[PDB]
């Protein structure tokens, strides 16, 4: 639906340009971070979400919401809350939750 998807484009653009987005703009490189592929079974990032959105592959807003929440779930799984990626992820998670709620 047009209303459901256009809002997703707004929120995704805002998340990409957010100051705290730096840990999530491209996929994590498992060659570079010890243990990532063992622990995070479904990686996800904003650029993957952007590819899928432009491709047309999101049917409803809820699927979009699932990939978005997946970014921050994986973040909290792998990083401690006081790590730098951790802290950034909490800012990005609170931003997403609040913004999603002032649409739906």
Q: What is the number of residues in the chain?
A: 104
Q: Could you tell me which residues come within 8 angstroms of residue 15 by beta carbon, excluding any fewer than 6 positions away?
A: 21, 24, 46, 68, 92, 95, 96
CA nearest 46: which of 61, 29, 67, 30?
67
Q: Among 75, 92, 93, 96, which residue sits at the site for ligand G0I (rule: CB under 6 A)?
A: 75
CA distance linking residue 103 with residue 8, whole number of Å: 10
Q: Minimal CB distance to ligand G0I: which residue?
A: 23
Report, in Å, the least distance between residue 35 CB and ligand G0I. 9
Pick between residue 36 and residue 100 the one whose CB is nearest to ligand G0I. Answer: 36
Q: Among 85, 87, 90, 99, which residue sits at the site for ligand G0I (rule: CB under 6 A)?
A: 85
Show contacts with ligand G0I in window 1-60 (CB under 6 A): 22-24, 28, 33, 36
CA distance linking residue 80 with residue 82, whole number of Å: 5
Residues that bind ligand G0I (CB under 6 A): 22-24, 28, 33, 36, 75, 78-79, 85
């Amino acid at each position: 639906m047009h209303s459901d998807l256009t809002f997703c484009e707004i929120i995704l653009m805002e998340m990409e340009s957010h100051d705290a987005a730096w840990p999530f703009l491209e996929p994590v490189n498992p060659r570079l971070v010890s243990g990532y592929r063992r622990i995070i079974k479904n990686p996800m990032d904003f650029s993957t979400m952007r590819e899928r959105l432009l491709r047309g592959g999101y049917t409803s807003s809820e699927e979009f919401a699932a990939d978005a929440l997946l970014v921050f779930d994986n973040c909290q799984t792998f990083n401690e809350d006081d790590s730098e990626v951790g802290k950034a992820g909490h800012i990005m998670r609170r931003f997403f939750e609040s913004r999603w709620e002032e649409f739906y």
